[PDB]
Write a protein that binds this ligand. Sequence first.
Ligand SMILES: [Li+]
Ligand SMILES: [Zn+2]
Length: 74
Amino acid sequence: MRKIQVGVTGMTCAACSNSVEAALMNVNGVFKASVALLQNRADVVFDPNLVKEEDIKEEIEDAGFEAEILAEEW
Ligand SMILES: [Li+]
Ligand SMILES: [Zn+2]
């Protein structure tokens, strides 16, 4: 696995953050998704054999938000 810190804009309630988490957990290859409503962040642990950063970004976009990778954690 690798871990990325994704920036997300548009989340303004608990349901929003939950929706982003749910969306991410439905992406094949994503092991863990932790969303921080207050910080415009979604931290994602994923298997690069099965999914990449762009796909993670796209899943968040498809959910209804805007996203870009902020940093690689490990
Ligand atoms: Li925010
Ligand atoms: Zn909301």
